[PDB]
Amino acid sequence: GSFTPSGTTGTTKLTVTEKCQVRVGDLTVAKTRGQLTDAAPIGPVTVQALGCDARQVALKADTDNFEQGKFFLISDNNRDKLYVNIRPTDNSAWTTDNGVFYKNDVGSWGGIIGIYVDGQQTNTPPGNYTLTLTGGYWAK
Amino acid sequence: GSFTPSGTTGTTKLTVTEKCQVRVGDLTVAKTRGQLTDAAPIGPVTVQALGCDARQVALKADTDNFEQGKFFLISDNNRDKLYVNIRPTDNSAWTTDNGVFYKNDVGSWGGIIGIYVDGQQTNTPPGNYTLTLTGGYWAK
Amino acid sequence: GSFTPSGTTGTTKLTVTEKCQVRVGDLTVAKTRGQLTDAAPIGPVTVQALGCDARQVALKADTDNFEKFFLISDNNRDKLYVNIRPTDNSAWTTDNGVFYKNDVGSWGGIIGIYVDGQQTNTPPGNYTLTLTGGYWAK
């Protein structure tokens, strides 16, 4: 299997906070650490393919966003991780392969990739966490 | 006194220009150097606290935005400074403590922190200036 | 000729893709490489001068955006050569990274960015052109 980068990069930002939470500036996604229970939604990643009627749509995470089997958001401190599962809201079939999440069937898919906490992680340190995904296509 | 970071970070960007001012791309805050008179408004910082009914809301400036006693926006050259005062528009009571601006009373405050020029600085070199504040809470 | 920086910096981003193009996150400008024919529009750059009734409006490109203007890949090798021209067809001049207006006045308008020479072999990637507002004097 091989990923060909071809499309834009979307960067999911999450701010983890304590119960008392102070939003400063533009609205962005924040969650308290008590909200980080297994399967809790973090946020959506919008996806739209064009010209892929005969290709398999895929997303590849940055190198520091996957440590095999698993995807995770990385802290700005380059240390703390928030493990997540990613899943299309339409329940179509996709596969995870070494940092690549690709759709099992060809077609110019459009949808939402939901990001959810993978295992309870209510001890996640407050800070700013990111997951970077780049669009492209997969082959075989 | 101790600040607990718990919330998002808002970055105020200011572009200082000459009289002939050429805005390129999307709207951002720009002011001519002649406009940097004592008390001149630079811009607002929106703040919204949640789950802090029993805590004191606070903002902490980045290390390079305060040189005790005083807050300032820092140039991208990391040299030039524009000193400012920050004050809530509702005139509520806050205290400054070594880079932290905290509310005197507990409660989930929402409001606007205005940034104002602290002393005439019409000789400010044209450039891009920033002040970064992070939401959290204080104690005592 | 001298450029005085005085105004904001606008950054034009272009994502070059293959035919099968996968957009992730919020809308941004993307073009397949087959779209990069000579004169193909890349995107506009809005410009608005104030207080320059007696000055010549100008834009200065970042050092890594002119040799000829070009967008530079995020990897820092690949270049997409372009020409910039105001949509209103007003008269401007290029001087070593500076694009300045031939007459004084607080011009407002759109600086169009167009492909300069066929470049359909442009590697996929993220390309940027950074322009800073200010004014020109001889």
Residue numbers in the entry:
A (entry chain B), B (entry chain A): 0 to 139
C (entry chain C): 0 to 66, 69 to 139
Please quote the authors directly.
Dr adhesins are expressed on the surface of uropathogenic and diffusely adherent strains of Escherichia coli. The major adhesin subunit (DraE/AfaE) of these organelles mediates attachment of the bacterium to the surface of the host cell and possibly intracellular invasion through its recognition of the complement regulator decay-accelerating factor (DAF) and/or members of the carcinoembryonic antigen (CEA) family. The adhesin subunit of the Dr haemagglutinin, a Dr-family member, additionally binds type IV collagen and is inhibited in all its receptor interactions by the antibiotic chloram­phenicol (CLM). In this study, previous structural work is built upon by reporting the X-ray structures of DraE bound to two chloramphenicol derivatives: chloramphenicol succinate (CLS) and bromamphenicol (BRM).
Ordering of the whole ligand in the P3 forms is helped by crystal contacts from a neighbouring protein molecule (Gln47 and Leu49) to the ligand atoms C7 and C8 (in the phenyl ring) and one of the O atoms on the nitro moiety (the atom labelled O9B); this crystal contact is missing in the C2 form and the ‘head group’ of CLS adopted a number of conformations that were not traceable. Overall, the CLS–DraE complex structures imply that (i) substitutions at the primary hydroxyl do not significantly affect the mode of CLM binding and (ii) the nitrobenzene group is not required to bind DraE.
